[PDB]
Design a binder for this molecule. Structure first.
Ligand SMILES: COc1ccc2c(c1CN1CCNCC1)O/C(=C\c1c[nH]c3ccccc13)C2=O
Length: 270
């Protein structure tokens, strides 16, 4: 109809995501089908329409520019919703990027981690909590060296009280969720960011089983600088209140002198 459907990009119990092209102007898009009976949490537009929470969250952040994917349009069907999302081209998610390249140089990890921090800060400033930050949910604009957060289907409105639901990725979930099924938004996000940063500089996640998450002992399987190890272990503090704020992360000595996105593309991507 309005969009030329291309190949399937991924699928799950939630639904299916296709590559697409907007017919009117040949704009690259992603077409995300969301099964109604599998929606974790429902949202509501100001006009009262019940929609998947991802629609609400994306609209709250889909303003101006940021490192968050833009929701271009959305439709409702009898049994599903259809989301039209921005699609960079060429693109590769961070999972495939690390799989092909192995552990990233710290200069490159610094650039990527900084951009993720800026994107997560933007979400929180807009009252949005992603709840599934991980390499698979980060797209790399290979030409511009810019990263973009994707998939808010596990997200929620940001609040200052405790969350008791979680449908994100378990190996990125904090020990307080594993033990008590309870967490606060910001400190749980910082934990996932610690997992992500370890993943970038070591080429794999640090914990596989619940017992390792609860123990919280970080072993580095790759050569990693002392400053980077410190930031990782700080983000992965067992006590949530011991974890750094976003400001403390970006003011950490390891985060100084970040490359610009285009510089990052020139040195590491082209
Ligand atoms: C199971 O696979 C999923 C699940 C959820 C989403 C999704 C995908 C497809 N891949 C899977 C592997 N990692 C990257 C995403 O894509 C999304 C949004 C996208 C927005 N614009 C894009 C452009 C290019 C590819 C993707 C998207 C999602 O929410």
């Amino acid at each position: 109809s309005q969009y030329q459907v291309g190949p399937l990009l991924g699928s799950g119990g939630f639904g299916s995501v296709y590559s697409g092209i907007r017919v009117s102007d040949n704009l690259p898009v992603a077409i995300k089908h969301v099964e109604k009976d599998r929606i974790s949490d429902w949202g509501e537009l100001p006009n009262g329409t019940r929609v998947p929470m991802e629609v609400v969250l994306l609209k709250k952040v889909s303003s101006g520019f940021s490192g968050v994917i833009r929701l271009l349009d959305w439709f409702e069907r009898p049994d599903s919703f259809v989301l039209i999302l921005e699609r960079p081209e060429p693109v590769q998610d961070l999972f495939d990027f690390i799989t092909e390249r192995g552990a990233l140089q710290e200069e490159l990890a610094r650039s990527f981690f900084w951009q993720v921090l800026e994107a997560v800060r933007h979400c929180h400033n807009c009252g949005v909590l992603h709840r599934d930050i991980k390499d698979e949910n980060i797209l790399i604009d290979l030409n511009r060296g810019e990263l973009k957060l994707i998939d808010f289907g596990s997200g929620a409105l940001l609040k200052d009280t405790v969350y008791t639901d979680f449908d994100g990725t378990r190996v990125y979930s904090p020990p307080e969720w594993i033990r008590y099924h309870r967490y606060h938004g910001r400190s749980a996000a910082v934990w996932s960011l610690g997992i992500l940063l370890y993943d970038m500089v070591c080429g794999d996640i640090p914990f596989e089983h619940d017992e390792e998450i609860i123990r919280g002992q970080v072993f580095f399987r790759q050569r990693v600088s002392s400053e980077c190890q410190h930031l990782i272990r700080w983000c992965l503090a067992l006590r949530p209140s011991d974890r750094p704020t976003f400001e403390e992360i970006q003011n950490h000595p390891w985060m100084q002198d970040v490359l610009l996105p285009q510089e990052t593309a020139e040195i590491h991507l082209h």
